A paper describes a structure:
Thioredoxin (Trx), glutaredoxin (Grx), and peroxiredoxin (Prx) are redoxin proteins that are important in regulating a variety of cell redox-related processes. Herein, structure function data including activity assays, mass spectrometry characterizations, and X-ray crystallographic studies, elucidating interactions between BNP7787 and human Grx 1, human Prx 1, and human Prx 4 are presented. These data characterize covalent BNP7787-derived mesna moieties on cysteine residues of human Grx 1, Prx 1, and Prx 4 and provide information about the functional consequences of BNP7787-mediated modifications.
Grx is a small glutathione-dependent protein, which maintains a reduced state of cysteines in cellular proteins, and is primarily involved in catalyzing the reduction of glutathione mixed disulfides and producing glutathione disulfide as a by-product. A high resolution crystal structure was solved showing the atomic interactions between Grx 1 and BNP7787. The Grx-BNP7787 co-crystal crystallizes as a monomer in the asymmetric unit. BNP7787-derived mesna moieties were observed as mixed disulfides on Cys 7 and Cys 82. Both cysteines that interact with BNP7787 (Cys 7 and Cys 82) are solvent accessible. The BNP7787-derived mesna adducts on Grx 1 are located at a crystal contact and within close proximity of each other (data not shown). Specifically, X-ray crystallography data herein shows that two of the five cysteines present in Grx 1 were modified, Cys 7 and Cys 82. Cys 22 and Cys 25 (active site residues) and Cys 78 were not modified.
Numbering used by the authors: -1 to 105
Write the structure that this text describes.
Amino acid sequence: GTAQEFVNCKIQPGKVVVFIKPTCPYCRRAQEILSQLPIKQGLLEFVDITATNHTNEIQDYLQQLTGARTVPRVFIGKDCIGGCSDLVSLQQSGELLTRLKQIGALQ
Ligand SMILES: *SCCS(=O)(=O)O
Ligand SMILES: *SCCS(=O)(=O)O
């Protein structure tokens, strides 16, 4: 369906969702950071925004929803973390782990 549906359907409280595209070094780094962690299977999802041939529309909606159109676009539940640098900052400070504990996402 619509870009809004594609995105909103995926974002869920308690779940880590990262919108990505192919050929995206920062997407791969975001994936590495999050895949290291003991997040429960099913509560981490990487979403290829190009797979339905509506890349631009999806980025347009991400821009509307979050203020930026770029991937990776990282969500912890409904919270938009932002991009890769944002995620790195949280990982390093320990805030990523604390947030995952609070929302019950660990295995
Ligand atoms: S909003 C979720 C739609 S679906 O994935 O069940 O098809
Ligand atoms: S994670 C994106 C690369 S960097 O800004 O953290 O150097």
